Structure 1
Amino acid sequence: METQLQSIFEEVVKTEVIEEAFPGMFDEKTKLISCLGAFRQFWGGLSQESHEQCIQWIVKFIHGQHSPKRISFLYDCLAMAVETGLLPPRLVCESLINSDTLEWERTQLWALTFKLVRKIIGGVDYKGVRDLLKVILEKILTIPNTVSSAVVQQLLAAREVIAYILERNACLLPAYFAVTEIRKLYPEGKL
């Protein structure tokens, strides 16, 4: 069941131990690649169709943490897994793009998500790519006008990735489709 996959991913990623008060001597490469291989074997096992909701569970578990270092290390393994060809982008983009953005709530999580989006911004995709653009703009418009003055660079990351997309549109993806996506945002001028 899905609970079996969740427990497997937990065991592959959770390393809960004692507080380690006593100085003990006895992961960036060994444990990361091991977890990657295990998750790849589970991928090859079964549940190809329902891996949409499975990856939804995955990102839910990822957001279930609070240590930015841990979330970053987690995002990194998915980053290498997608860049090595495995786990085609479309799935992970369509999953992470919604239900876990936490608009200007978790500045660290938001930042890392948009950084990995910038990394995967290559993202070879069919005509069904306007949807994620609409999702990004819809998430952006929810941001207020006077949220703060220090959290900027973290928010520029969304601006950075959308600028990357809108500029590469001349050479990366169909431009006219992107233009038609903005019509939901530009009704002849609505600030």
Structure 2
Amino acid sequence: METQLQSIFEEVVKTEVIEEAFPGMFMDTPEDEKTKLISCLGAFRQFWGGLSQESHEQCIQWIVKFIHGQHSPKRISFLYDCLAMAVETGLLPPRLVCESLINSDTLEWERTQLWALTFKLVRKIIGGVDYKGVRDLLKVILEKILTIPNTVSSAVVQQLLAAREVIAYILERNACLLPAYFAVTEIRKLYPEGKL
């Protein structure tokens, strides 16, 4: 079953070996981003509609560990666009994706492009979570931000700051994702009185 999803997603992003010898002579434009996304979304929709409810989440953990196992950032952003349209079309419940994205232990701050693209996608898809899920996401995002040192490199700081926009979006009072009392309760549980 994870073999099925393995064959699907690996057959999505295969790379051509014999190209760069006789470059561009093969008669075939490789599916550009939109057609490839539509085909990927269709095949994953087949596997998802086939899938059972209780098996709904271990496959998503496999998806996110397969995305975080990648190395090319274009590949990662393509599969994140796939996950974004898979949430946007209504196929996926928009809480499992966010939780398995953040609680993935491959998400460390040293993987700065993965950090930036991940928290960009969570900023995209957090608007649909119910408020208790937003509260638990707030807690795990704060605990993810808490692992950064006092000093980091001067180039990675802007890609690290992508979590700050998710935090600013959750604690924004006009957006009203959750009651603000819950937000200050989670914060003051993590930063009690006297802690910067």
TM-score, scaled to structure 2: 0.88
Instruction: Kindly indicate whether residue 46 of structure 2 is the aligned counterpart of residue 31 of structure 1.
Output: no
1:23 is displaced (CA, Å) by: 2.1
Identical columns (%): 100
Partner of 2:67 in structure 1? 62
Looking at structure 2, the residues matched to 118 and 16 of structure 1 have their Cα atoms a distance apart, in angstroms, of: 33
Partner of 1:8 in structure 2? 8
Change (3 A) 1:128 1:28: closer
Looking at structure 2, the residues matched to 160 and 130 of structure 1 have their Cα atoms a distance apart, in angstroms, of: 16
What are the Cα deviations for residues 70-116 of structure 1, in whole angstroms up to 9, with x where unaligned? 11111111111211222121110111111245332111110000111
Runs of 4+ in 1 over 4 A off after TM superposition: none
Looking at structure 2, the residues matched to 178 and 15 of structure 1 have their Cα atoms a distance apart, in angstroms, of: 45
What are the Cα deviations for residues 95-141 of structure 1, in whole angstroms up to 9, with x where unaligned? 11112453321111100001111111312314243211110011111
Q: Which moved more, 1:155-164 or 1:2-11?
A: 2-11
For residue 132 of structure 2, give the secondary structure of its aligned residue in structure 1.
coil
1:12/1:38 contact within 8 Å kept = no
Looking at structure 1, the residues matched to 63 and 85 of structure 2 have their Cα atoms a distance apart, in angstroms, of: 16
Looking at structure 2, the residues matched to 143 and 49 of structure 1 have their Cα atoms a distance apart, in angstroms, of: 35
Looking at structure 2, the residues matched to 14 and 188 of structure 1 have their Cα atoms a distance apart, in angstroms, of: 52
Looking at structure 2, the residues matched to 44 and 66 of structure 1 have their Cα atoms a distance apart, in angstroms, of: 29
1:16 is displaced (CA, Å) by: 4.3
1:169/1:175 contact within 8 Å kept = no
Q: Which moved more, 1:142-151 or 1:124-133?
A: 124-133
For residue 189 of structure 2, give the secondary structure of its aligned residue in structure 1.
coil
Change (3 A) 1:170 1:109: closer
1:3 is displaced (CA, Å) by: 2.0
Q: Which moved more, 1:129-138 or 1:162-171?
A: 162-171
2:65/2:106 contact within 8 Å kept = no
For residue 25 of structure 2, give the secondary structure of its aligned residue in structure 1.
coil
Looking at structure 2, the residues matched to 99 and 121 of structure 1 have their Cα atoms a distance apart, in angstroms, of: 17
1:15 is displaced (CA, Å) by: 4.0
Q: Which moved more, 1:135-144 or 1:78-87?
A: 78-87
Change (3 A) 1:184 1:36: same
Change (3 A) 1:137 1:158: same
Uncovered stretches (5+) of structure 2, i.e. residues with no partner? 27-31
For residue 151 of structure 2, give the secondary structure of its aligned residue in structure 1.
coil
For residue 99 of structure 1, give the secondary structure of its aligned residue in structure 2.
coil
1:19 is displaced (CA, Å) by: 3.9
Change (3 A) 1:185 1:115: same
1:51 is displaced (CA, Å) by: 2.2
Looking at structure 1, the residues matched to 138 and 111 of structure 2 have their Cα atoms a distance apart, in angstroms, of: 21
Change (3 A) 1:71 1:149: same
For residue 21 of structure 2, give the secondary structure of its aligned residue in structure 1.
coil
1:176 is displaced (CA, Å) by: 1.2
Partner of 1:114 in structure 2? 119
1:13/1:35 contact within 8 Å kept = no
